[PDB]
Amino acid sequence: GAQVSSQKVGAHESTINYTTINYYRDSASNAASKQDFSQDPSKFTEPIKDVLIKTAPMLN
């Protein structure tokens, strides 16, 4: 049940990895993976009904 993932290596001395094993039945007991996703800001930065083309006049 071991999970093997790669570290993003910052200062250096191939891919360096690290190992994780969950010891408990409840996912709440688990540490945070920090393997998170990003998304585009659009729902907050461009919430307009008609798609904005930045080279175009915003008002037409």
């Binding site: 049940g1 071991a2 999970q3 093997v4 993932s5 790669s6 393997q35």
Partner: peptide
């Protein structure tokens, strides 16, 4: 056994 991400 092992998962590899």
């Amino acid at each position: 056994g092992s998962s590899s991400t």
